[PDB]
Design an enzyme around this catalytic site. Structure first.
Site, PDB file in Angstrom:
ATOM      1  N   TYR A 293       0.808  -1.207   0.000  1.00 27.50           N
ATOM      2  CA  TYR A 293       0.000   0.000   0.000  1.00 27.50           C
ATOM      3  C   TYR A 293       0.854   1.276   0.000  1.00 27.50           C
ATOM      4  O   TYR A 293       0.428   2.346  -0.504  1.00 27.50           O
ATOM      5  CB  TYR A 293      -0.913   0.013   1.237  1.00 27.50           C
TER       6      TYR A 293
ATOM      7  N   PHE B  62      -7.832  20.695 -24.787  1.00 25.01           N
ATOM      8  CA  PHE B  62      -8.404  19.366 -24.816  1.00 25.01           C
ATOM      9  C   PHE B  62      -9.570  19.345 -23.832  1.00 25.01           C
ATOM     10  O   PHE B  62      -9.531  20.020 -22.800  1.00 25.01           O
ATOM     11  CB  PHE B  62      -7.350  18.331 -24.412  1.00 25.01           C
ATOM     12  N   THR B  63     -10.597  18.562 -24.158  1.00 24.72           N
ATOM     13  CA  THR B  63     -11.830  18.453 -23.358  1.00 24.72           C
ATOM     14  C   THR B  63     -11.642  18.277 -21.828  1.00 24.72           C
ATOM     15  O   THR B  63     -12.174  19.073 -21.053  1.00 24.72           O
ATOM     16  CB  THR B  63     -12.748  17.312 -23.897  1.00 24.72           C
TER      17      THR B  63
ATOM     18  N   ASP C 119       1.316  19.409 -20.749  1.00 24.07           N
ATOM     19  CA  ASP C 119       0.577  18.173 -20.910  1.00 24.07           C
ATOM     20  C   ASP C 119       1.480  17.280 -21.747  1.00 24.07           C
ATOM     21  O   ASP C 119       1.545  17.408 -22.976  1.00 24.07           O
ATOM     22  CB  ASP C 119      -0.759  18.383 -21.608  1.00 24.07           C
TER      23      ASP C 119
ATOM     24  N   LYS D 229      -0.705   6.853 -23.265  1.00 21.82           N
ATOM     25  CA  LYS D 229      -0.266   7.192 -24.624  1.00 21.82           C
ATOM     26  C   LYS D 229       1.220   6.837 -24.718  1.00 21.82           C
ATOM     27  O   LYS D 229       1.571   5.678 -24.835  1.00 21.82           O
ATOM     28  CB  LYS D 229      -0.539   8.689 -24.950  1.00 21.82           C
TER      29      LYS D 229
ATOM     30  N   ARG E  28     -15.409  12.452 -34.836  1.00 20.57           N
ATOM     31  CA  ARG E  28     -15.025  13.687 -34.153  1.00 20.57           C
ATOM     32  C   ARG E  28     -15.612  14.856 -34.985  1.00 20.57           C
ATOM     33  O   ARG E  28     -14.914  15.555 -35.746  1.00 20.57           O
ATOM     34  CB  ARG E  28     -13.507  13.784 -34.018  1.00 20.57           C
TER      35      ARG E  28
ATOM     36  N   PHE F 256     -22.491  11.087 -28.124  1.00 25.67           N
ATOM     37  CA  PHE F 256     -21.626  10.326 -29.029  1.00 25.67           C
ATOM     38  C   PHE F 256     -21.419   8.890 -28.549  1.00 25.67           C
ATOM     39  O   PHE F 256     -21.131   8.003 -29.342  1.00 25.67           O
ATOM     40  CB  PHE F 256     -20.271  11.043 -29.216  1.00 25.67           C
TER      41      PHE F 256
END
Ligand SMILES: [K+]
Ligand SMILES: [K+]
Ligand SMILES: [K+]
Ligand SMILES: [K+]
Lengths: 456, 456, 456, 456
Positions: free
Chosen positions: B71, B123-124, B214, B257, B381, B448
């Protein structure tokens, strides 16, 4: 499509790299100019063999986590057993750690000293286990199988005249069995037709002669039947495999080839008494009949892999990927064995190295040269592999003096095939630079695995 | 080389069903012509996203078996920590379960209500967390970035003049931070130059303003710098990455990514006080500073993956594989966003389906056609993903009406890219035949994800 | 049996080792006398927590190889979804990376600022997410739950008088929901009876008040019902679990406890509108509704683990192993919370350290001392964990000042429990040597995770 | 400490069914009261063998993901090679799929027809390969070894006087080699002293005779030397192992025992000429000198496992766990072979079932009773396994009529040992009730494997 895309995705990868020409030349000499003697880290694209080098699937790896490692009664043994009964149709199965373990059993079980075993072209470990148990090997493949450039279908087919002749001249009682390999490895991975398997079964049965298959690339073979034998175009790979074995009394298999695994094999038979005897023997060499020198997880992987092999798109792509390499090489004028086989492209070393005699070991030499020039490992399939004649002491002298670019299943892409095809073409550009080799160390049998040479 | 061979080989495969066109049409229909509703088991090539869909290596999988699941104080945390410190050169790191967890923490830590955050487009999720925490977003990307047809390098660059203007008009004390994304997602995966990163660091530092990156596709970014920015030719990918982050006060990363994993992310910073505040917050949302909502095994896989991502040949091939798909489409005249980015190709469905109005959902319909014809899943998109204004009832109408072909890392081959391209090219040849779609089921939110359609 | 043997075999192992007393003392000081701050390599038997530390099975690991990592439509999501629908009986499921992600969603979805949430004793992350969303926490557990030495069954039970009182005094419209935890963690892992869950459902339903369960140790809870509640002796664990949830409107779960996994959680509900809203929110914090910040392989492992948890012999042994430790400690006169709970033995720090006031942080201190003397890590469950009162600024002062020997599932043996019981007994022999602690660093919330102290 | 706690924790479990007595009786009946015929899936605790049934570590499992499956030159081979060279101090190593593969090679390499091989008792496969190759076996173990009730240390020791006599009577040139097994299986797992190994080396060397070790349980052996042989108290297990093999010319090893793997073995030697001959033979039966019938991943697992086996606390616990079971049985008066060996306890079924004659198969019946009462599988090592003389039709009648409780490494706990012991002890308390068995099906060969019985 001529060249279908991979009918799977990549789940996981392994890195590849090349070491400089300079480092490789050093490497070739230390390995005695024998490709078998180089190290995996020192090879960029490893086409030494399709034996045990295959990529497993996610499902097989899931199976690898469920290894039931019990000495007897493993769920994995039961799964392998029922899978092989279902797909091949034989009554009994004895697992072995790989193919030559199964050949050891078959040769001990089925041969009386002085008997003949006849087959469709020799194979290395096969011929050794025959001769070592006192049999004389008789080649009953059609003559054309030995003709590298001759493009004919089903080159693995047994010559029925040659089989008939053998029976007339030797007497059926003196023929231990017919060994029918599917596909035939040293002819270039050449298939056998269903028509031939049927004709062979019918003739042998009439004389009480047993037939045992070498099943090692039986799925590749079934693909060629589906693609090329009239009447099979709408049968499944599975239906074709099951019919093929319906013409045999048992089989030997290196699962390391068409079962899509890294280790594993088995012996199958229909005969109850032969099954009992086989179980007595497996204990000596392999393990208990309930694991045969395999972990539970490997029996599991082999069971799963043999069933995955039955998927049409998988075997179609497997064979056509090899064909792509062959087609590229041929389009550029590189001499190869034709037609291209199920598992490898065999460069014809005799045409590749016209200026060498076969006593100069062209094939063995060329394999070394491809390595030095490209970092691609390939295997000798010529006079070195053929071994020595046990009556005379001279080299066996096969018409096929070939060098094997052998493709592991589900490992490489067409882009890798393109890298290979380019390297070879370039080396062809100066093939007269390939020098004669001679022995500096010769093992007493299966000499090709570890023999070492020096340039003449 | 335009299109290098894969710098790896396949270790294991992921099985796929290979269902034919007629069965794919039924699946598409059962999914209401919404590719988001398709079952993974029914898809050959899944280009919905490059997030969390990457193939791991054998080394990563070995790391997966070595999870220290403690942990607190896990060896895998210490491995991740030292790797990120070494590679990114930030003082402190807090792991998170993925990118938006890190973004949640950053925005709560760094934003006072009413302050501005400025960045290179948005970005969203990133912008969501900025605004939910009281920030006003200001786009400071070069005007050129918004021209989807303009083929120019380093299209993700911040316009220094827009940043200056922002500082002059609003005051430095009212700017929370500059958020620089490498690469920039919404422009089609567009890189930022090292020159731009230094210019931004120098300006911000002069006014005491923070800069956070980012870092989600920072390795793809580093590859573009190596390939295209003068002076970076003798620099390794690792050297380029470390220099990039030297121009930042910290970063957020979706490891899913460029860290070559299926889950994972982290937050980095140099400021000791911010680090302390971050560890106080991580426990509310994610987990301990030493796991942050990740298993030990995943911290291990991400540590190993990030280091694998530094290999030049890997990231060269990654980006050039996407480029291959873009190049092939463009050569056939298929309308795409330009230039092609590091991780996806975007089809311009507005131009592809000129016979259709945006109200007939050309991107959504085109993604449907692509699946039916090829077994390839792509993401809408366009207008559907833009959502509906719930006040007015009107569609939000985006300038970009696109289908995203998003490429997971190390999963697919050029032959798969050919399946995608050949199918789209064939559709393009009779583009007038593509039918418009209409809603038959529309949720009030997240439309969507679950909307269903039928043809007009 | 009082102490059944493990109803499984060991498939694979991990090494354990101790570091000398001298090295550990150094280690304790560097970690600020906070056990949470030591390192996994430096702990011999790690009883810090049963959260995420469990041993998975061979079947779960097989599942781990079949991760379908697709962004939407993963076979693993479908499997998790149908497993939870079947076993818990709720209509809808939203995966989260772990329990506090699900609590974040529930608290945001179901609480209006100023409302009350009432539950059976507070929990750390739970109370924080309630208060942070503007709710006042009201403890409606029976008084006896707070009495450490009092051995009564079903100490987790809600006091129905206290719930009635709350409704009379506040009005049902001002109660957001009842939060019923099964088992109750801080009372010592104490179960709730089926009779109580039924009575609570009946009363709340009459007033239109919603009930949400914290399902984190629901299987442990079901064991206690089977063992101790008249009428359940012949019901299956599965039948008991399904009936339990039939009395709730949804639940939150940390799968890291009773689902037998190292990461994972979910939110369930019956309400369609709440489901839609939850999916909007999960996107902000966790991921798409189709993975919720989990890899496919972890959704798979959790699906498999939750079903394995239903096996009677497994949960019987789980609970009785903990009970063994408790029994050994008690037989020797060591003060503990009684009766022993499902997941840990809680040393009663107040009796263990009579000479300390609770403002001296006895529990926090004792945890440090056990580490120094034994190399066993345990967790503070007293005044430090209780946090500060957000109205007054003073410490909350729980009657239960306890120190937790928390047992991960399927990790240790009885011999390990014997090693632990011996170490503790010895330290008891001189418990007056345990010194007062005070803060040197206090985080603003959830302070126990990373707070540091010095001896007074 | 008499009985140390496990020096490891559980990483993953193997699921078991937990079927009750009544269902176990039906399984036993379906198996014809032959425990060899039981399905693994129906067994709680499987003590049939310690061969290939061990639990691997997390480090081994990581190695399993790192298989370099190259046909020749695998990194895993080089790792195995250097580990065995380091740990055993032999010059050369040839991997084999398991022990009997190595034994096959040794006996073919080292025996001329008519020569004697002498050793400390014998093992079935070992002696088989000796005799099949023309050797006469001579037992040179101390007379004491044959007294199964005699509690004496180092009961596996060779009687130097018997060896001298052999040399004097037959001549050194007629002795192929001395085969020294560490530990000695047929005496119940009895160790050999370092003093004895040196004395044997000195005598043999003086006459030019070779010594080869059966290294199968050499680590258990090394533990007995450390525990019981004067002067070895300051010596590590690794130091003791390396000294042992310094008294040999080579060894054969079934890695499936003390190398902590599920498959694998090897042959070692110091002689260059023998090494060369071995590599010529390995290819006929096993595979390349660099895989020998093993996957790359298994060479890796065995390399890692052999090094784990050197940890003192591991092998101390391994041997003391078996000792625990033996001690508990003896204390209750249960008749066992003495002293207890490193890997198994043998019940004396002749004395256990004194009311039965050997012709009623007391060992076979007792193994049946044990399974029914406890779910524990044990092996008959008595009259049934001895087989029938096919010439005369008479049973082979062994002095040892035993049930073998063989303990896999790292699989079971002391609580499992209690299940075994408590069940046997309960059976012993009413031993007169155990019924004799009679054949209902008997094969002509390998009868123990598939024979079926019913009660008299
Ligand atoms: K994923
Ligand atoms: K964990
Ligand atoms: K095994
Ligand atoms: K292999």
């Amino acid at each position: 499509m001529n060249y279908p895309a991979e009918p799977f995705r990549i789940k996981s990868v392994e890195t590849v790299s090349m070491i400089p020409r300079d480092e490789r030349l050093k490497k070739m000499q230390e390995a005695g100019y024998n490709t078998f003697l180089l190290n995996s880290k020192d090879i960029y694209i490893d086409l030494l063999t399709d034996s045990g080098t295959n990529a497993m699937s996610d499902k097989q790896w899931a199976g690898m986590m469920m290894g039931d490692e019990a000495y007897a009664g493993s769920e994995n043994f039961y799964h392998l057993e029922r899978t092989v009964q279902e797909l091949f149709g034989f009554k009994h199965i004895v697992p072995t750690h790989q193919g030559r373990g199964a050949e050891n059993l078959l040769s001990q079980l089925a041969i009386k000293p002085g008997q003949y075993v006849a087959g469709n072209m020799y194979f290395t470990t096969t011929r050794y286990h025959q001769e070592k148990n006192g049999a004389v090997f008789v080649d009953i493949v059609r003559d054309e199988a030995h003709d590298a450039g001759l493009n004919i279908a089903f080159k693995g087919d047994i010559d029925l005249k040659k089989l008939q002749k053998l029976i007339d001249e030797k007497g059926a009682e003196n023929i231990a069995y017919i060994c029918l390999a599917v596909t035939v490895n040293l002819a270039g991975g050449q298939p056998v037709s269903m028509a031939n398997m049927r004709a062979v079964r019918e003739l042998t049965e009439a004389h009480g002669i047993k037939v045992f298959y070498d099943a090692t690339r039986c799925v590749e073979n079934a693909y060629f039947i589906k693609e090329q034998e009239q009447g099979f175009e709408n049968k499944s790979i599975a239906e074709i495999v099951h019919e093929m074995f319906s013409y045999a009394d048992g089989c030997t298999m290196s699962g390391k080839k068409d079962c899509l695994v890294n280790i594993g094999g088995f012996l199958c038979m229909n005969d109850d008494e032969m099954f009992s005897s086989a179980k007595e023997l497996v204990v000596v060499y392999e393990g208990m009949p309930s694991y045969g020198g395999l972990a539970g997880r490997d029996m599991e992987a082999m069971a799963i892999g043999l069933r995955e092999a039955m998927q049409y798109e998988y075997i179609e792509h497997r064979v056509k990927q090899v064909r792509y390499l062959g087609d590229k090489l041929k389009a550029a004028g590189v001499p190869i064995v034709e037609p291209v086989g199920g598992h490898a492209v065999f460069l014809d070393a005799r045409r590749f190295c016209e200026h060498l005699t076969q006593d100069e070991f062209p094939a063995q030499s060329l394999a070394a040269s491809i390595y030095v020039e490209t970092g691609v490992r390939s295997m000798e399939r010529g006079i070195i592999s053929a071994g020595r004649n046990n009556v005379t002491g001279e080299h066996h002298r096969p018409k096929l003096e070939t060098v094997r670019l052998t493709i592991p299943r589900r490992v490489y892409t067409y882009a890798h095939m393109d890298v290979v095809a380019d390297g070879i073409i370039k080396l062809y550009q100066h093939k007269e630079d390939i020098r004669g080799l001679k022995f500096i160390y010769e093992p007493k049998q299966l000499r090709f695995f570890t023999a070492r040479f020096d340039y003449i």
